[PDB]
Amino acid sequence: CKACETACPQDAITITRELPERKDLVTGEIEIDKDTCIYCGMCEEMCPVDAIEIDHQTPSSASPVVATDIRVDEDKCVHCGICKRICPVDAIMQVCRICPYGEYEIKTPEVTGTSY
Amino acid sequence: CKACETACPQDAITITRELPERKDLVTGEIEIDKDTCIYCGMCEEMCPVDAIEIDHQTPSSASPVVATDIRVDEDKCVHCGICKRICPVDAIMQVCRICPYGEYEIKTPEVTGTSY
Numbered sequence A, B: 001c002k003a004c005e006t007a008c009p010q011d012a013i014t015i016t017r018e019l020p021e022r023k024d025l026v027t028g029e030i031e032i033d034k035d036t037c038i039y040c041g042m043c044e045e046m047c048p049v050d051a052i053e054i055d056h057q058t059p060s061s062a063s064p065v066v067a068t069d070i071r072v073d074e075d076k077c078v079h080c081g082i083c084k085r086i087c088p089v090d091a092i093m094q095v096c097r098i099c100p101y102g103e104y105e106i107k108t109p110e111v112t113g114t115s116y
């Protein structure tokens, strides 16, 4: 818990702990149909964990688009559903699996560490 | 809605309508492990839509069992979860997908018919 590390008046204590990765405490599916996507940016703004990334650009006559790609980083996504609800053209498919499949897909966290 | 069919004092109106099938308004997985199953009948009794069927029999020395098969009719199952909770030997695996996947797996009902 690291209380003693904080409490030690001489900073004599080191407490380490390895926590689980975020991806492993969460489960769901998410896909963005980039052809439907019109790159309004609203999902990128609203995503509270900054998992969505858009390759913005200034258009040119060779490339007359305001963006060239959009991606979701599933290492960060926690499947809150905000992006799919805000998308004006319903280009995002997103479903959280925690309640139906959480027992099987999310391993109970083992917290490791050492003291010195 | 057929109110006019009912209201017509001369029974002059025919109104038809084709409702969706029950299976298409509902989503889930369900399977029964027949080797674990002891054929106690509790799920068949509790199933509120009579979706579970047990092939009961009187035992004989050639066939010393009180039932030879058990089945779930998924055309009838609405994935309420009762059978799995009542099962004394946890022989039923059942998952309901309605809330997480209902947006994608359950098609919006569109009710057709005509008038005369």
Ligand code: SF4
Pocket (backbone or CB within 6 Å): A001, A002, A003, A004, A005, A015, A115
């Ligand atoms: S000891 Fe292990 S536990 Fe007791 S405090 Fe220091 S850390 Fe938290």
Ligand code: SF4
Pocket (backbone or CB within 6 Å): A032, A036, A037, A038, A039, A040, A041, A042, A043, A044, A070, A086, A087, A088, A089, A090, A091, A092
């Ligand atoms: S919102 Fe729907 S549309 Fe606007 S960007 Fe994120 S995805 Fe492309």
Ligand code: SF4
Pocket (backbone or CB within 6 Å): A030, A046, A047, A048, A049, A050, A051, A052, A072, A076, A077, A078, A079, A080, A081, A082, A083, A084, A094
């Ligand atoms: S889901 Fe909640 S989190 Fe995963 S991306 Fe769309 S928003 Fe960012």
Ligand code: SF4
Pocket (backbone or CB within 6 Å): B001, B002, B003, B004, B005, B015, B115
């Ligand atoms: S008309 Fe079509 S709607 Fe108006 S009542 Fe007879 S049925 Fe219900």
Ligand code: SF4
Pocket (backbone or CB within 6 Å): B032, B036, B037, B038, B039, B040, B041, B042, B043, B044, B070, B083, B086, B087, B088, B089, B090, B091, B092
């Ligand atoms: S309850 Fe568990 S056991 Fe008794 S029947 Fe339905 S399944 Fe086979």
Ligand code: SF4
Pocket (backbone or CB within 6 Å): B030, B046, B047, B048, B049, B050, B051, B052, B072, B076, B077, B078, B079, B080, B081, B082, B083, B084, B094
């Ligand atoms: S789930 Fe609800 S419905 Fe489908 S079977 Fe077990 S009980 Fe009958």
Ligand code: SF4
Pocket (backbone or CB within 6 Å): A099, B096, B097, B098, B099, B100
């Ligand atoms: S809640 Fe969990 S269970 Fe009750 S319905 Fe929506 S999904 Fe099926």
Ligand SMILES: [K+]
Pocket (backbone or CB within 6 Å): A005, A006, A007, A008, A009, A010, A011
């Ligand atoms: K300290």
Ligand SMILES: [K+]
Pocket (backbone or CB within 6 Å): A044, A045, A046, A047, A048, A049, A050
């Ligand atoms: K953001």
Ligand SMILES: [K+]
Pocket (backbone or CB within 6 Å): B044, B045, B046, B047, B048, B049, B050
């Ligand atoms: K029944």
